[PDB]
Amino acid sequence: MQSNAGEFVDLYVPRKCSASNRIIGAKDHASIPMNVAEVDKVTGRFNGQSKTYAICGAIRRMGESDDSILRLAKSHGIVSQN
Amino acid sequence: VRMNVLADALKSINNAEKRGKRQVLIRPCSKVIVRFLTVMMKHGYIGEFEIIDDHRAGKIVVNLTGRLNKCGVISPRFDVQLKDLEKWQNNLLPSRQFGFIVLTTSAGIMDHEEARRKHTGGKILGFFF
Amino acid sequence: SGALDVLQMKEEDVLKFLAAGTHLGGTNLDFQMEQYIYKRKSDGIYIINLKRTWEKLLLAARAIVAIENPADVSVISSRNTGQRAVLKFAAATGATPIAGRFTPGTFTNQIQAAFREPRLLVVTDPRADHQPLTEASYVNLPTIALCNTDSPLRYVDIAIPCNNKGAHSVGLMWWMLAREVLRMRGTISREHPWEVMPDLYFYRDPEE
Amino acid sequence: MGRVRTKTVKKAARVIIEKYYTRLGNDFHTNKRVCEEIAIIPSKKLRNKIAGYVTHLMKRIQRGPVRGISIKLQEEERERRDNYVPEVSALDQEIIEVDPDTKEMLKLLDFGSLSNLQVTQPTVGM
Amino acid sequence: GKAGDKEWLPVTKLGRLVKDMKIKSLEEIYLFSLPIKESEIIDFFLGAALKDKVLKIMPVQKQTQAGQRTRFKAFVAIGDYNGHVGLGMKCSKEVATAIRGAIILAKLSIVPVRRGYWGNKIGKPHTVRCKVTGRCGSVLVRLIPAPRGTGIISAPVPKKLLLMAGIDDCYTSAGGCTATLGNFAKATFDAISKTYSYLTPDLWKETVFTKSPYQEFTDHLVKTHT
Amino acid sequence: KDPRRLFEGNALLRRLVRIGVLDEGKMKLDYILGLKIEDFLERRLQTQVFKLGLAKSIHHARVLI
RNA sequence: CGGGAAACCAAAGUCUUUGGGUUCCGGGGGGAGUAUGGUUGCAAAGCUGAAACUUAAAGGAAUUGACGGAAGGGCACCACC
């Protein structure tokens, strides 16, 4: 949303679904993401450091949010042979 | 039966993206479908596609992201006169700025921007944004 | 694997699971659950993928850690088989509770006396606990859930396939979650075994 | 019937009982005195009507827990009762009897176990 | 002014962050898609210097045992002039309450508007990025970007809403029973709100995004009560 | 660059500037689009005969003229 | 999902983001399927089908009472027994 002199105008840049790459817009409160903990490898020891995904109202109402998370969590770990 | 084949491919796509789908199998495909899928591709509105070869007429798999609000087909394929292109894009595009009208001209299936630059014109195929 | 090793399967657990008869799975699959399914037993019944049941449970556990204030993860059950179960989970991990008649207007509706703003809901039957699952979807709160093969997938992100027909399957899975979360971002340390007998989770019931 | 206690009364009874159980009694005459000590009630007829219904409750409570009333002592009693556990019941006795396939369930689960086979016949719907 | 400010106290964690000066703009809420249940939140973050115009009064009624009933319905719109607007309809026993409640309802509903350039983007957005339409029970309003000086070409009621929204220039076409005002304003309200939903190519790329002020401020938003 | 747009655009601008109605950055078409009535109204006699003392009123001005 | 004014509708969906093929009928309500000419019919009648004039609502859907010699309903010697 540039303006004349490369300036950034209007007022915000919305987050985009983690499954459908579609704008979460802005009053659709039937939607939320999901912070997964990073682990200090080895195992346990929750260390931050979120691995995070945002899922749209749409996907969730269509009886996905879950799987989407899995394509999301495995593709970037953890989660394997799902 | 079938009059056109493009219109089916486009619709199939639109319903895929509307569902929340990331792939489609269109059938049966054609040189014109390829060319249109291709113009879409150059611009980002779809990912990569693949023509599978049944010993028949073809089947295409399109992998789609989700930048696509709509890809429509115009029927019939009206003739356009260089200052009917200006009239078309206004009729059916979201802002002057973006979205393409894609037509077929003597010098190739092209988005209207490429049309304006070449300086040729022809008959209207469809659109997207 | 993933996060790197020890965290994998452990026969010890695959033993508690098979024992508690989790994997047994519903005769009616349901479409969104098809992935969980390992194989269909003759004489109709499905074998859930414990390996899959396992890993997701761990994925669940991890999402429960990462919430900073442990109190505000709500463990929920109106089902009897899961009532002592969740009460126990809330005792160990921070985790506030919601058993029995969920009470409508608990997430929407400030005014109410059971008004809660969780950052994570964990539900045990998405069909029995449909109210909480619906209310949660009125206010941007993620959901872990107990799902057998034929449970509603609407508004639930993360399933842990179970059996939820019942017995200790509901007991063990809540147990293992609390066991898992205490390990992660907790302080069990040494994704070594339990001083707590898993029976402690498990339904009570009646008297003559 | 004609005397159906109204909420203003019934509430007070649930109320007192919740905060008064070990104080209250079996007998109308005494609670009535107690309501003077533990509550401020405006007319004597009301206070009587209250004492009376709450006694009808105490008479009932002292014969079986009543649908919506909780007191510290009753909680303690349920707590102790809710301990029980024997020789224990499964056993299940030497050897599980399986339905097979459930036998093939272990057989193809990499799992030893006790055994028995009796699983045949199909198998009508309805 | 001096009348003795009230004593808002918040039900909601989102609210605590706002009063604490922890949340400062609605954008945070909008990006997070936090629901807003306490009207004061809207009041503190914006609304200050946001003006509410009452659109309509029309009365209705329904039948009692011993005959009739009748009551007042008020349609209220709220918005600064830039980028924020809300719409609220209420029916109540008394006009004042109907208006007073309507305003509250409008504020809760406040919505983002994405305002854009007819084409050559100099000196900040005059119109709309694309063309967005909204429908409410057979009335449908279509907004179209227009060149500068075009202004709001709409019916008076719609012009008023679009005005508060902060749109300078826009073309409109309306179909359906435009007469039924509650419907027409509602559709237009949906139309404007749809601008945020449009994905343009500018938007095509993604983002660590945010952690949510709810999470960072979490302690802050569990005070010392219960 | 379109001979029609160039030849007439520049002319419209130059015409609009001779009268002071318009200014240079304006003095392109992108700016006339973002213009208004006062800008014309400001150039009439009447208001000038005020604007340099020689009237002291938009009034006086019109009867003077 | 989405449609529709709703009742409803997996088609009445993919319709303002309005464009797959083709065919038919309607443009407030009454006058009227009437007059009149043509046509078909043994006959009874059928098809095509106006106007003058008349009139500001005709109509649809949902919502709610009132009311019922509709169904389960009750309650009272201002009701019966």
Curated annotation (Swiss-Prot), chain A:
Its main location: cytoplasm. It is found in: Cytoplasm, Cytosol; Cytoplasm; Rough endoplasmic reticulum. The keyword ATP-binding does not apply. GO terms for molecular function: structural constituent of ribosome. There is a cross-link at K41 (Glycyl lysine isopeptide (Lys-Gly) (interchain with G-Cter in SUMO2)). Signal peptide: none annotated. Keywords: Acetylation, Cytoplasm, Endoplasmic reticulum, Isopeptide bond, Ribonucleoprotein, Ribosomal protein, Ubl conjugation. The keyword Oxidoreductase does not apply. InterPro entries: Ribosomal_eS21, Ribosomal_eS21_CS, Ribosomal_eS21_sf. The modification N-acetylmethionine is found at M1. GO terms for biological process: translation. One of its GO terms (cellular component) is ribonucleoprotein complex. Component of the small ribosomal subunit. The ribosome is a large ribonucleoprotein complex responsible for the synthesis of proteins in the cell. Belongs to the eukaryotic ribosomal protein eS21 family. Component of the 40S small ribosomal subunit. This is Small ribosomal subunit protein eS21.
UniProtKB/Swiss-Prot annotation, chain B:
The keyword Cytoplasm applies. Disulfide bonds: none annotated. It is found in: Cytoplasm; Nucleus, Nucleolus. GO terms for biological process: translation. GO terms for molecular function: structural constituent of ribosome. The modification N6-succinyllysine is found at K87. It holds the Pfam family Ribosomal_S8. InterPro entries: Ribosomal_uS8, Ribosomal_uS8_CS, Ribosomal_uS8_sf. The keyword Transport does not apply. Its main location: cytoplasm. It comes from the Eukaryota. Keywords: Cytoplasm, Nucleus, Ribonucleoprotein, Ribosomal protein. GO terms for cellular component: cytosolic ribosome; nucleolus; ribonucleoprotein complex. Component of the 40S ribosomal subunit. Part of the small subunit (SSU) processome, composed of more than 70 proteins and the RNA chaperone small nucleolar RNA (snoRNA) U3. Belongs to the universal ribosomal protein uS8 family. Component of the small ribosomal subunit. Part of the small subunit (SSU) processome, first precursor of the small eukaryotic ribosomal subunit. During the assembly of the SSU processome in the nucleolus, many ribosome biogenesis factors, an RNA chaperone and ribosomal proteins associate with the nascent pre-rRNA and work in concert to generate RNA folding, modifications, rearrangements and cleavage as well as targeted degradation of pre-ribosomal RNA by the RNA exosome. Required for proper erythropoiesis. This is Small ribosomal subunit protein uS8. The gene is RPS15A.
UniProtKB/Swiss-Prot annotation, chain D:
GO terms for molecular function: structural constituent of ribosome. Disulfide bonds: none annotated. The gene is RPS17. It holds the Pfam family Ribosomal_S17e. One of its GO terms (biological process) is translation. InterPro entries: Ribosomal_eS17, Ribosomal_eS17_CS, Ribosomal_eS17_sf. This is Small ribosomal subunit protein eS17. It comes from Oryctolagus cuniculus (Rabbit). Its main location: cytoplasm. There is a cross-link at K103 (Glycyl lysine isopeptide (Lys-Gly) (interchain with G-Cter in SUMO2)). Keywords: Cytoplasm, Isopeptide bond, Nucleus, Phosphoprotein, Ribonucleoprotein, Ribosomal protein, Ubl conjugation.
Swiss-Prot record, chain F:
There is a cross-link at K28 (Glycyl lysine isopeptide (Lys-Gly) (interchain with G-Cter in SUMO2)). It comes from the Eukaryota. It is found in: Cytoplasm; Nucleus, Nucleolus. The modification N6-acetyllysine is found at K1, K51. Belongs to the universal ribosomal protein uS4 family. Component of the small ribosomal subunit. The ribosome is a large ribonucleoprotein complex responsible for the synthesis of proteins in the cell. Part of the small subunit (SSU) processome, first precursor of the small eukaryotic ribosomal subunit. During the assembly of the SSU processome in the nucleolus, many ribosome biogenesis factors, an RNA chaperone and ribosomal proteins associate with the nascent pre-rRNA and work in concert to generate RNA folding, modifications, rearrangements and cleavage as well as targeted degradation of pre-ribosomal RNA by the RNA exosome. Component of the small ribosomal subunit. Identified in a IGF2BP1-dependent mRNP granule complex containing untranslated mRNAs. Part of the small subunit (SSU) processome, composed of more than 70 proteins and the RNA chaperone small nucleolar RNA (snoRNA) U3. This is Small ribosomal subunit protein uS4. It comes from Oryctolagus cuniculus. The gene is RPS9.
